[PDB]
Amino acid sequence: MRECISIHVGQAGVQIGNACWELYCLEHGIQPDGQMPSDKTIGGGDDSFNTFFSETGAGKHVPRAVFVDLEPTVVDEVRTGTYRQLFHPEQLITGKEDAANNYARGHYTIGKEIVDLVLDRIRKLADLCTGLQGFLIFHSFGGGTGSGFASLLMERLSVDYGKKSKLEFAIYPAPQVSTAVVEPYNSILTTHTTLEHSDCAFMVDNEAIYDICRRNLDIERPTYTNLNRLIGQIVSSITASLRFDGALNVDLTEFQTNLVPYPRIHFPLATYAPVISAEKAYHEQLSVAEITNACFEPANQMVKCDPRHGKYMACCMLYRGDVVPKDVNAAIATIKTKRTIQFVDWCPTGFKVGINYQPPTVVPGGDLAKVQRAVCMLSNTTAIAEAWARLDHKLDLMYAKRAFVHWYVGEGMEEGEFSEAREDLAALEKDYEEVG
Amino acid sequence: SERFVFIAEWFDPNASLFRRYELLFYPGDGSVEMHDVKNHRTFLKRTKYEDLHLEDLFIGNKVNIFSRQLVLLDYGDQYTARQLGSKKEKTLALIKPDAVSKAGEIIEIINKAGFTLTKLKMMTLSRKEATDFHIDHQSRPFLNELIQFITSGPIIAMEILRDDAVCEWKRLLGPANSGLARTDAPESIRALFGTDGIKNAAHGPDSFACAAREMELFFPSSGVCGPANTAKFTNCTTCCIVKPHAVSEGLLGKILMTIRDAGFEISAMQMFNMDRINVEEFYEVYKGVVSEYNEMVTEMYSGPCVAMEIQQTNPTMTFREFCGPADPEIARHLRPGTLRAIFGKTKIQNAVHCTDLPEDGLLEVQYFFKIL
Amino acid sequence: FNLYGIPTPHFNDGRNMAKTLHWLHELQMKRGAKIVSKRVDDFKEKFQ
Amino acid sequence: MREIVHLQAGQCGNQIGAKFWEVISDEHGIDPTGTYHGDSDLQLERINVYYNEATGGKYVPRAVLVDLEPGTMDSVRSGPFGQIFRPDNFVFGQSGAGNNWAKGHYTEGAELVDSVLDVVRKEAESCDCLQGFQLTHSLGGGTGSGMGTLLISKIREEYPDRIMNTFSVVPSPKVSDTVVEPYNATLSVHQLVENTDETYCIDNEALYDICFRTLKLTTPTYGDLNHLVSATMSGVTTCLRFPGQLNADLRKLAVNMVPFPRLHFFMPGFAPLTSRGSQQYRALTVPELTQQMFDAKNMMAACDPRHGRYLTVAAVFRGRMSMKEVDEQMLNVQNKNSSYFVEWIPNNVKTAVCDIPPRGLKMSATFIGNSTAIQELFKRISEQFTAMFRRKAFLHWYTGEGMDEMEFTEAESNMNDLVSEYQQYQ
Amino acid sequence: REIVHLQAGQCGNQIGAKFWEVISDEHGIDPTGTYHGDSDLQLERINVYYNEATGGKYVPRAVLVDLEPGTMDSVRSGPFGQIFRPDNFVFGQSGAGNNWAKGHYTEGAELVDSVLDVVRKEAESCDCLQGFQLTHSLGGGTGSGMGTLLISKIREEYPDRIMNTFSVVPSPKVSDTVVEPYNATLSVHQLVENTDETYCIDNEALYDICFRTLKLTTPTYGDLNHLVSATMSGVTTCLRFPGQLNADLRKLAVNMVPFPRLHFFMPGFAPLTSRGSQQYRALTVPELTQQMFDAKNMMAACDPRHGRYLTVAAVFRGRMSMKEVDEQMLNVQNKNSSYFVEWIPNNVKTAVCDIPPRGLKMSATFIGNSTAIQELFKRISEQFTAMFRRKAFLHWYTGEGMDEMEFTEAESNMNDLVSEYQQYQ
Amino acid sequence: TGIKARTQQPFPPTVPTKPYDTTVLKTRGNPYRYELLDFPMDSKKKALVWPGQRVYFDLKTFAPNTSLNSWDPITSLKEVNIQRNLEKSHWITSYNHDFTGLGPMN
Amino acid sequence: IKQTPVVLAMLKGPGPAKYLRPSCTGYIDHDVSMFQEPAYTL
Ligand SMILES: Nc1nc2c(ncn2[C@@H]2O[C@H](COP(=O)(O)OP(=O)(O)OP(=O)(O)O)[C@@H](O)[C@H]2O)c(=O)[nH]1
Ligand SMILES: Nc1nc2c(ncn2[C@@H]2O[C@H](COP(=O)(O)OP(=O)(O)O)[C@@H](O)[C@H]2O)c(=O)[nH]1
Ligand SMILES: Nc1nc2c(ncn2[C@@H]2O[C@H](COP(=O)(O)OP(=O)(O)O)[C@@H](O)[C@H]2O)c(=O)[nH]1
Ligand SMILES: [Mg+2]
């Protein structure tokens, strides 16, 4: 029981899976070739790997995840690197060609002739384990496969399963800083068709975590490997309660019932408080009463939307490590008693607490330090209404003279799809300001 | 992490079968967790357990995990076998007929050097048992003298737990001739308590095969006991049992010393690790006459106890006054020279249990030396 | 590779609650006999 | 004789029940294997109140454990006292409640109610004469608030004369643990009134105030809180299983507590509670347990009694005491502060004295009190409910499971009458 | 007949800590709470000051209240400081800052509700209350601010009992605080109205009696605290030990207070010798009663030469005969007739116990209600009017809930009380 | 209750006992004044050593007695009894001095 | 200002949501505590 299936779409999703699964193989004793060490284990009895690994006859722990990328070029390395004996060979699905920053190519033309194979593999994964709790799909927004093929899979997963959980992380474009020119098109077209097929989307940007790797980790000029390990750290701290004992356990069907008031308001941003270096932790004591406060700092937060101007709607504190409930409740009362955290008038409760009994694990090579306390606040706030406004202002600028449209309408896409996508994104912007 | 895995075996009294298990000790974060071999599942989660210690984990040891007398049979892995088999080595520690009187110092030096007692009993060797003993010494010069020396008086054989136990006990023994130990390598027990080269103080093996053969001669595997017990079922016979609390910190040798100093002599001795169903078949006469009884009864099956026979030869002071009051504070206020006044404390893990009723001295000695 | 952070020792099973409800006055009559003066005894037999 | 059937709904109820069967096994001397190992002969002659046994003299608890998830059932089964429980007393489902009053009560819990009714009624019939039912569950959750609410709904459907005892773990005033807790609190309290005879409300920040201000602990975990709750809650049924001078079962308590059947919300306490370094300078007499029980810092509902007069009071006593001193203390505390007691009842205090103190104590007590000032808690839950529900904010988590919209209005209006019809009778 | 003890401020806490020394070695109470005395008399009336708990440990009826957390450490780690009840240790976080405003009006309003609970717990568990004892300093911010607040809040709750205040009056030579007169005149306004008996202690008189009488080399604060504790334990000695004559804590009030607002006393302790010259003194009643009425054997800076006595108390301790006691009282009245008022014929009150202090043979204790105490209040009035005229340090008070008119009302009652003391001479 | 009684661990019941062994975390920076106070296990008490000043550590006299156990003169045991009886003779009271027995007391 | 009475214990002061620092990402409003990195023109 207590199982989870992780879906890894796109370059961002398939490079996150090369670092989050390193952490997964490091929490338990999983060697990079999918086995326990020489003995270093019992003759059976342990079942904490049941959520993410499947137990076979010879003792191999095969992950229950699917790697999908229309580009072959990135999955070629997870199948040839140091983790080539861990992944099941048919869990790594690749095709002919990439989508090349096109929603149309990943959604209509090249999307269809791989969807059936991916769904067959999801079927083969689902009957392998009895009690399935939900799906953890990670992809991107500015690309072509993470934006198109993943959004095509949301339609194929909400009909076959129904009431299963759909949790998103979904690498989101940064405000000042971008990578591709046409990415407002793909971002709007993938937020138009993924509204009623998901219920939790944990937005992060690649700029705020760059600034965080300049805050706390004492590194200069980081790269994506210093990014995906932090992402996978918060991923494992979200689902730490399924496999480890604790005081207040939180399952996968809990974030929807708390963080989602309205079906169109399901975008809680994440935050990992005790991001720190080993040197910077040598002069600070890691207590509950500052990791509680570090989550509400604009410095430690994700997407730079200035949450002083926002209104908090629903928070979900997931504590980890050496924690007693007394200082947790004292710190929560402290941060409640302060005025500068604006809370909306119709949520007098506002908090959800989950306490585990396991300290986080550290990786050899990551600049994160060994600590005793860790939280991950998935906070839902109105401050991302500015994010959508500055995201679709770029579409308003680009669509005003029909730039880059001929690559879309020339391949399986209709001209009327753009207008209704901007229209319902405007509806999503309109309903966000009437909840404040 | 760095957990230590053991294969366990618990006998269910309700269903007549043995249930195998798997206990995991975590040093530092002192805690246990339990797993099941047949019917693969978990039994006890990660709970911090305070009564389990690293010195109490070895093959053949009875341990108490939440009121269960589970036995240890083998290491779970080859990591724990590597990280414990180099520090858990058994060798025979024999004591010749001399320094049976001077036996407290032998136990004191053994306990001071980092050894652990698991098994102990006091016998006399018959003619055939002392002829199979000294088999390498056959048709050598001094055979009759050693044979008639071994068959003279009582023999105390005990076990030894230490890393590199054989070589360390041979170092502690010194050279076999007591003159060489007196001259060349002094402060050894052969220098201290040996007189001749025949009249040695103690003897042990040199290798593993000789130690195993000596072990099989002296202590058969289960059931049949080889030698006798030398129990002197006389009128002036009483009992005293040393609680595992006293044997854990090496108070056994000092107990023997201060018993021999008062004039009382010991006729029999044996190391026991009794089950719950036998001690709660021995101590339920104290049901209701004592203030606390459940922790008193689980204290003395928590480890190995030394049950011995002691005779009253000191005039005008019986042994029941030599041990003293049951409450050690009444002993320390009233009779500062008694056994509980200077050895035991806290009224539950006191030093020894002397027989309260002078009519009942043959019954409990009888029980300990024929029933078990 | 060192544990950094202020360690708060705590017991999760609840042994602190078991100890704190044992009322440390007869916890020590279990491990001895209390020794009060004797003049106070002859007072307490006579005006108590 | 007077058997009690125990119910444990939800993960909070499972934790409290695990700690309770840890602590009450020490009163009767039950080891985790199941055999009996005690000091006195008095702790086995009333084993029928809580324990059933089998062939071999090993005693199993008469408790039925229910949770929709099987997760906490592994925590209960693999604890120190996880083998005495019956293996088929663990009923469980395939999925979770997610802190919803709809999912554990109408759709998924509606399959599990019949499963726990399979075992509960059999365990009811095998007793020669039942006393009643006892429930430990949470209110702000979904499994305890949804499964056990239908349970106490359809136990009185076929056992209308037994005493219903619940241990309502009520949400805290300031700090919250679930965002949708006012829904699961109001919708469970609305069904609490029509189907319960005795309800005691236990908070969590009040336990915190106990453990930090009157016990002086630095790190209070949930094991300590569960042990305090179980020590309070093993004190009500003392005379049911130990002899004394003025005995009292659950029915006698419930007769002396409630004057009207809509008014059965009580508020507990526990007298010998002082810091472990402060036990040297405090004597153990009745005129100090009486002082502690009436202090504001020894009451688990965290409602100030200055805001409402008591209706009826009960004080179960343990230990060899003098009844004369107890009557003196009760009369004096009723006469000194006459402004905090009602006038239309002559004697507001019921006194029951057992003879056997808890192990590790020489004198203890348990305080169960019906108070008007428990309306302050319902006022907070009503304020949260009318703040959140006022334009059908969270309707969509309570429409997809078949709950109707007017059910909220009924669950408010039939719970607001616990305030309008609570000050007239005061 | 039991006494609940209070102590506020650092000086009051130290004075109480040295008073419990004398009490606990008088009654044979161990520094941990056990009993180690010899006589049965110590255990007879041990309930006057102490409480019996299980284990036979004896704990005082003292409530520990102040504002400054570091004076915990000067009490709990003291020589006899382990016997105190830890639940009676209540005080707040921030310091007093030597402000009457901070100790009485704004910060102190949140501590009084918590210290009255401990006072209720200690006083309501008695069989018969008799009064309250308070040791405090009039010049501080805690003893002078929260002391009068506690007296005000206690007088309403228990109006039919008596009050004892042992107030350290400001001295001009020992000037250890700049804002001394402001705290002086803000304290005795609320001390005159409700408190029925007040023993005034001056530090310069204590230094004078440690220099000229005891001939001490280096007198620290410990010697002065010991002297004020010797006075403290001598006024309630009839409550704790039998004697040939009785004086409980209300007979002193009835004998010594003839008019409601004339209740300020001059305490003293007679049998004080030189340091090494104890071999040259005859320990007789005439010698001690001649030293007792001597001017420099007082504990207040005001000279009895300049005024006239109203009432005089004398609490003797020891197995002395009553003839020399009452004859010597008759003598000291007959030859000092100008220094006693003519409208009261007998001006002395005598009492004899049977237990002398530890380390002596016979002792007495002088308490004096005289009109010579007006000079001390007069110099307090001059020090007040010098500062207040130019509004010198008013902005640390008026910034925390004060008016100007409160100070003028305090001064008005000051010269009013001086006028009533002067009018009867 | 003297120097020889100040040595035996079960001391006779007239000598005061030492305040118990405490570790100290002064307030002064910490939120709570924690004190691990060891309670000696009955018979292992300790005769009291420093009633002169603070038991904390220190800050010009004798806190303990001066007759050190190293040097000799503790003799003249008839001499020390007289003051023990004389302090006892100060605690006799008037009624027990006069109306006790068949008349006053010699 | 300073003449307003307040209890000194209730003066904890502003918490973790009063200040933001300026970004390291971009020459526009760079915080003066870290490397600026160059900003080459045409
Ligand atoms: N945080 C993080 N972001 C990544 C990573 N890899 C790619 N991205 C983001 O993804 C964008 C690159 O385009 P992708 O969407 O990943 O490309 P794709 O998913 O393969 O889609 P196509 O390129 O059209 O095939 C960049 O703008 C990054 O912001 C990664 O490893 N970590
Ligand atoms: N006292 C106590 N309360 C608990 C414990 N576990 C959970 N709770 C309370 O239960 C409430 C939430 O219940 P929940 O976890 O949702 O129960 P569920 O419906 O079964 O999932 C919280 O407000 C907690 O205060 C416990 O071990 N002890
Ligand atoms: N007799 C005596 N007086 C003291 C002692 N300590 C301080 N004082 C006096 O008390 C005054 C200080 O008052 P203080 O207690 O510090 O102010 P508070 O804390 O606000 O009450 C000074 O003028 C000192 O002369 C002491 O140990 N004995
Ligand atoms: Mg791609």
Side-chain angles (χ1 to χ4, degrees), chain F residues 63-96:
Chain F
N65 54 77
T66 193
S67 202
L68 317 168
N69 261 334
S70 34
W71 51 45
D72 165 60
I74 202 50
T75 175
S76 80
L77 316 168
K78 182 193 339 157
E79 172 47 1
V80 287
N81 261 30
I82 284 284
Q83 319 118 292
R84 174 151 191 200
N85 304 317
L86 193 48
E87 172 176 49
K88 269 161 137 192
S89 147
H90 265 151
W91 286 62
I92 272 298
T93 70
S94 307
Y95 165 88
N96 245 355

Side-chain angles (χ1 to χ4, degrees), chain A residues 247-248, chain D residues 10-12 15-16 67 69 99 138 140-144 169 177-178 204 222 225-226:
Chain A
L248 285 38
Chain D
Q11 67 152 49
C12 155
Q15 294 305 85
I16 292 182
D67 191 336
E69 298 137 44
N99 300 152
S138 165
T143 314
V169 179
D177 293 355
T178 323
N204 283 136
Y222 270 133
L225 309 198
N226 291 341

Side-chain angles (χ1 to χ4, degrees), chain A residues 12 16 139-142 168-179 183 187 201-215 222-224 226-232 234 267-272 297-307 383-384 386-388 390-391 394, chain G residues 21 23-26:
Chain A
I16 278 169
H139 56 87
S140 48
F141 270 15
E168 280 306 70
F169 296 55
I171 272 296
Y172 182 80
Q176 310 176 8
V177 53
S178 159
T179 307
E183 85 165 319
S187 192
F202 307 125
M203 281 315 79
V204 290
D205 53 337
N206 262 5
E207 172 276 349
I209 318 180
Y210 278 169
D211 294 342
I212 276 178
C213 261
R214 291 197 85 178
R215 267 26 160 184
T223 179
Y224 283 161
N226 332 109
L227 267 276
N228 308 354
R229 297 220 206 84
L230 197 135
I231 294 307
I234 87 171
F267 298 88
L269 53 93
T271 296
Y272 212 59
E297 201 32 44
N300 205 317
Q301 218 174 88
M302 291 325 178
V303 277
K304 279 323 197 102
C305 316
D306 214 318
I384 41 183
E386 185 70 29
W388 296 119
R390 184 181 300 221
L391 179 61
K394 303 153 84 173
Chain G
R21 54 70 170 157
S23 170
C24 327
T25 311

Side-chain angles (χ1 to χ4, degrees), chain B residues 112-253:
Chain B
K112 250 199 316 177
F115 291 72
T116 279
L117 284 179
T118 73
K119 154 189 37 203
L120 200 151
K121 65 163 311 163
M122 189 168 124
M123 327 85 86
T124 47
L125 294 198
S126 169
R127 185 63 58 88
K128 274 336 294 157
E129 281 156 89
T131 310
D132 159 273
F133 187 29
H134 311 153
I135 172 53
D136 322 308
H137 213 316
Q138 162 43 301
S139 75
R140 304 301 211 61
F142 281 66
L143 182 55
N144 217 359
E145 279 72 7
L146 290 168
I147 278 184
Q148 301 229 307
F149 166 55
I150 281 301
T151 63
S152 61
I155 271 287
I156 294 177
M158 89 209 48
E159 280 316 270
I160 281 310
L161 271 283
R162 206 192 110 104
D163 40 331
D164 191 31
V166 181
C167 200
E168 223 287 330
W169 208 59
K170 289 306 249 201
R171 212 283 317 284
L172 281 193
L173 257 285
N177 254 269
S178 310
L180 268 65
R182 275 186 278 265
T183 53
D184 313 43
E187 281 44 33
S188 84
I189 79 163
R190 279 166 166 161
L192 290 173
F193 318 112
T195 58
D196 314 43
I198 295 298
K199 284 330 316 283
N200 224 349
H203 172 77
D206 60 15
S207 61
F208 174 51
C210 206
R213 194 253 292 171
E214 257 288 346
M215 260 303 316
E216 296 323 293
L217 161 66
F218 264 67
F219 287 106
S221 298
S222 69
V224 188
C225 194
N229 204 357
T230 76
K232 290 186 179 72
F233 299 124
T234 322
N235 330 312
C236 44
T237 286
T238 193
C239 157
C240 56
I241 48 184
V242 185
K243 315 263 163 85
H245 163 247
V247 198
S248 89
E249 51 255 34
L251 303 185
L252 181 57

Side-chain angles (χ1 to χ4, degrees), chain A residues 136-155:
Chain A
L136 266 285
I137 325 174
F138 314 148
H139 56 87
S140 48
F141 270 15
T145 83
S147 166
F149 171 62
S151 65
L152 188 58
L153 247 66
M154 321 285 278
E155 258 81 47

Side-chain angles (χ1 to χ4, degrees), chain E residues 8-12 14-15 96 98 137 139-144 168 174 176-177 180 203 221-222 224-225 228:
Chain E
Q10 298 171 240
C11 155
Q14 290 285 343
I15 281 186
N98 286 26
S137 93
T142 279
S144 161
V168 174
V174 195
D176 282 32
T177 293
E180 262 323 278
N203 267 121
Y221 277 151
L224 325 173
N225 291 345
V228 84

Side-chain angles (χ1 to χ4, degrees), chain B residues 46 55 91 94 155 198 203 298 300 307 346:
Chain B
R46 188 84 89 93
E55 32 255 65
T91 168
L94 199 46
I155 271 287
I198 295 298
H203 172 77
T298 173
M300 77 187 72
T346 59

